Structures are given as structure tokens and as C-alpha cells.
Write a protein that holds these residues in place. Structure first.
Motif, PDB file in Angstrom:
ATOM      1  N   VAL A 113      34.765 -36.515  -7.902  1.00  0.00           N
ATOM      2  CA  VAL A 113      33.996 -35.281  -7.566  1.00  0.00           C
ATOM      3  C   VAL A 113      33.937 -34.343  -8.761  1.00  0.00           C
ATOM      4  CG1 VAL A 113      33.899 -33.225  -6.133  1.00  0.00           C
ATOM      5  CG2 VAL A 113      34.585 -35.409  -5.129  1.00  0.00           C
ATOM      6  N   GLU A 114      32.714 -34.007  -9.163  1.00  0.00           N
ATOM      7  CA  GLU A 114      32.481 -33.110 -10.284  1.00  0.00           C
ATOM      8  C   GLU A 114      31.642 -31.948  -9.797  1.00  0.00           C
ATOM      9  OE1 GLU A 114      31.343 -36.629 -10.650  1.00  0.00           O
ATOM     10  OE2 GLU A 114      33.540 -36.759 -10.831  1.00  0.00           O
ATOM     11  N   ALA A 115      31.638 -30.874 -10.570  1.00  0.00           N
ATOM     12  CA  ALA A 115      30.852 -29.708 -10.221  1.00  0.00           C
ATOM     13  C   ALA A 115      30.550 -28.917 -11.475  1.00  0.00           C
ATOM     14  CB  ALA A 115      31.613 -28.838  -9.232  1.00  0.00           C
ATOM     15  N   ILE A 116      29.578 -28.026 -11.372  1.00  0.00           N
ATOM     16  CA  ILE A 116      29.205 -27.195 -12.504  1.00  0.00           C
ATOM     17  C   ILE A 116      29.346 -25.734 -12.081  1.00  0.00           C
ATOM     18  CG2 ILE A 116      26.824 -27.419 -11.782  1.00  0.00           C
ATOM     19  CD1 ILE A 116      26.026 -26.993 -14.784  1.00  0.00           C
ATOM     20  N   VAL A 117      29.900 -24.934 -12.992  1.00  0.00           N
ATOM     21  CA  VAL A 117      30.163 -23.516 -12.767  1.00  0.00           C
ATOM     22  C   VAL A 117      28.915 -22.649 -12.693  1.00  0.00           C
ATOM     23  CG1 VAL A 117      31.577 -21.559 -13.499  1.00  0.00           C
ATOM     24  CG2 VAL A 117      32.250 -23.887 -14.133  1.00  0.00           C
ATOM     25  N   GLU A 118      28.741 -21.964 -11.561  1.00  0.00           N
ATOM     26  CA  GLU A 118      27.599 -21.074 -11.362  1.00  0.00           C
ATOM     27  C   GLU A 118      27.961 -19.621 -11.682  1.00  0.00           C
ATOM     28  OE1 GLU A 118      24.183 -19.957  -8.052  1.00  0.00           O
ATOM     29  OE2 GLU A 118      25.900 -21.224  -7.499  1.00  0.00           O
ATOM     30  N   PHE A 119      29.181 -19.214 -11.318  1.00  0.00           N
ATOM     31  CA  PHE A 119      29.650 -17.849 -11.579  1.00  0.00           C
ATOM     32  C   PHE A 119      31.011 -17.870 -12.268  1.00  0.00           C
ATOM     33  CE2 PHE A 119      26.333 -16.174  -8.981  1.00  0.00           C
ATOM     34  CZ  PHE A 119      26.213 -17.046  -7.905  1.00  0.00           C
ATOM     35  N   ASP A 120      31.227 -16.930 -13.190  1.00  0.00           N
ATOM     36  CA  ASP A 120      32.508 -16.835 -13.898  1.00  0.00           C
ATOM     37  C   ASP A 120      33.600 -16.399 -12.932  1.00  0.00           C
ATOM     38  OD1 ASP A 120      31.360 -17.412 -16.396  1.00  0.00           O
ATOM     39  OD2 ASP A 120      31.104 -15.287 -16.910  1.00  0.00           O
ATOM     40  N   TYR A 121      34.825 -16.822 -13.208  1.00  0.00           N
ATOM     41  CA  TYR A 121      35.958 -16.418 -12.390  1.00  0.00           C
ATOM     42  C   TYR A 121      37.214 -16.441 -13.233  1.00  0.00           C
ATOM     43  CZ  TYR A 121      39.678 -16.182  -9.003  1.00  0.00           C
ATOM     44  OH  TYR A 121      40.816 -15.790  -8.348  1.00  0.00           O
ATOM     45  N   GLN A 122      37.986 -15.358 -13.159  1.00  0.00           N
ATOM     46  CA  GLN A 122      39.226 -15.269 -13.911  1.00  0.00           C
ATOM     47  C   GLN A 122      40.416 -15.521 -13.002  1.00  0.00           C
ATOM     48  OE1 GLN A 122      40.403 -15.307 -17.017  1.00  0.00           O
ATOM     49  NE2 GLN A 122      42.393 -15.277 -15.961  1.00  0.00           N
ATOM     50  N   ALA A 123      41.271 -16.454 -13.408  1.00  0.00           N
ATOM     51  CA  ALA A 123      42.455 -16.784 -12.637  1.00  0.00           C
ATOM     52  C   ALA A 123      43.188 -15.488 -12.328  1.00  0.00           C
ATOM     53  CB  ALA A 123      43.359 -17.732 -13.432  1.00  0.00           C
ATOM     54  N   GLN A 124      43.956 -15.500 -11.253  1.00  0.00           N
ATOM     55  CA  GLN A 124      44.714 -14.332 -10.854  1.00  0.00           C
ATOM     56  C   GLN A 124      46.146 -14.794 -10.597  1.00  0.00           C
ATOM     57  OE1 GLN A 124      42.307 -11.574  -8.161  1.00  0.00           O
ATOM     58  NE2 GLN A 124      40.865 -13.295  -8.162  1.00  0.00           N
ATOM     59  N   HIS A 125      46.345 -16.111 -10.640  1.00  0.00           N
ATOM     60  CA  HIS A 125      47.655 -16.729 -10.446  1.00  0.00           C
ATOM     61  C   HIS A 125      47.779 -17.856 -11.467  1.00  0.00           C
ATOM     62  CE1 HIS A 125      48.552 -14.546  -6.768  1.00  0.00           C
ATOM     63  NE2 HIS A 125      47.382 -14.896  -6.265  1.00  0.00           N
ATOM     64  N   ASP A 126      49.004 -18.137 -11.891  1.00  0.00           N
ATOM     65  CA  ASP A 126      49.249 -19.184 -12.872  1.00  0.00           C
ATOM     66  C   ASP A 126      48.781 -20.564 -12.431  1.00  0.00           C
ATOM     67  OD1 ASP A 126      52.377 -18.003 -14.436  1.00  0.00           O
ATOM     68  OD2 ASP A 126      50.257 -17.443 -14.708  1.00  0.00           O
TER      69      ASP A 126
ATOM     70  N   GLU B  80      28.447 -28.560  -6.440  1.00  0.00           N
ATOM     71  CA  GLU B  80      28.882 -29.950  -6.523  1.00  0.00           C
ATOM     72  C   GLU B  80      27.728 -30.811  -7.047  1.00  0.00           C
ATOM     73  OE1 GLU B  80      29.985 -31.639  -2.723  1.00  0.00           O
ATOM     74  OE2 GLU B  80      31.396 -33.011  -3.704  1.00  0.00           O
ATOM     75  N   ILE B  81      28.032 -31.697  -7.997  1.00  0.00           N
ATOM     76  CA  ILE B  81      27.040 -32.584  -8.619  1.00  0.00           C
ATOM     77  C   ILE B  81      26.693 -33.755  -7.690  1.00  0.00           C
ATOM     78  CG2 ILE B  81      26.476 -33.901 -10.713  1.00  0.00           C
ATOM     79  CD1 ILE B  81      27.082 -30.981 -11.149  1.00  0.00           C
ATOM     80  N   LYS B  82      25.557 -34.414  -7.929  1.00  0.00           N
ATOM     81  CA  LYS B  82      25.137 -35.553  -7.103  1.00  0.00           C
ATOM     82  C   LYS B  82      25.321 -36.932  -7.748  1.00  0.00           C
ATOM     83  CE  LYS B  82      20.922 -37.839  -5.365  1.00  0.00           C
ATOM     84  NZ  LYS B  82      20.693 -38.634  -6.609  1.00  0.00           N
ATOM     85  N   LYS B  83      25.554 -37.934  -6.900  1.00  0.00           N
ATOM     86  CA  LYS B  83      25.723 -39.326  -7.324  1.00  0.00           C
ATOM     87  C   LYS B  83      26.879 -39.570  -8.289  1.00  0.00           C
ATOM     88  CE  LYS B  83      24.709 -41.435  -5.324  1.00  0.00           C
ATOM     89  NZ  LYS B  83      25.008 -42.781  -4.756  1.00  0.00           N
TER      90      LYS B  83
END
Ligand code: NA
Ligand code: NA
Lengths: 11, 57, 56
Positions: free
Chosen positions: B1-14, B54-57
Motif C-alpha cells: 500500500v502506497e500513498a501520496i501526500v496531499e497536505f503537509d503535517y508535522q509530527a507531534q509525537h516521536d 491512496e495510490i491505485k494498482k
């Protein structure tokens, strides 16, 4: 231009 | 399963993965709750599912 | 189109809808991006859609 989405709480 | 980032997000936990718009996320392990685990070249970690597509195929 | 709140959300804006777990959201009109417009009581506003479950 929608506002930034919110992550679901860490529960 | 792969995906591509649409919105930025900063970790908040290690245990979270900081993703940026465009990057491809791999080794993705789903799970209900709003958080997925996967890797983006560098680190692996929990990132928010609604911020990526989520990416296809 | 209605839904029920799964997580609590304090509206951080004049045009945002404050929601509380269990509440029934109705007259919800969807729109990509992570925010929906719906109604609770006599109050309406925008709230994050991943914070509620759409009733079947
Ligand atoms: Na998603
Ligand atoms: Na939802």
C-alpha cells in the motif's frame, strides 16, 4: 481554498 | 500500500511521520482511527490518513 | 444527509460549528478538503468531517 484539515485525535 | 501526500503535517509525537505535499508513502499499514504507519524515504511513522491519497494498482 | 459526532470539536472560527460526541448533525452539505457544513440545534457551521460518522 478550504482551510487546513484536522487530524483525528490520538486515542 | 502506497500513498501520496496531499497536505503537509508535522509530527507531534516521536512516533509520527512528518509528511510534505507530493511525497510518496510506502510500506503503509492501514488501521481504523485516522492514523496510518508507513515510510517516506527517510523515517517511518504514524501519519494522518485524511492528509494523503491512496495510490491505485 | 445527517451524521453523529465521534470526536469533540471546539469551533475556532466565527463560521465554524462546535460539535460534541453523540450529537446529530443534519442538513450536512459536503465539500472536499476535510470540512463539512451541517447543523445541530439551531446552530450551523463548518466542522471537520473525519470527526463525525455519516449515518446510514
Ligand atoms: Na485519505
Ligand atoms: Na467522516
Amino acid at each position: 481554498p478550504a482551510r487546513p484539515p484536522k487530524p483525528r485525535p490520538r486515542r | 500500500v502506497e500513498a501520496i501526500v496531499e497536505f503537509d503535517y508535522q509530527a507531534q509525537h516521536d512516533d509520527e511521520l512528518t509528511i510534505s505535499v507530493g511525497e510518496i508513502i510506502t510500506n503503509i499499514r492501514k488501521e481504523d482511527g485516522g492514523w496510518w504507519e508507513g515510510q517516506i524515504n527517510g523515517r517511518r511513522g504514524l501519519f494522518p490518513d485524511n492528509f494523503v491519497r491512496e495510490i491505485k494498482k
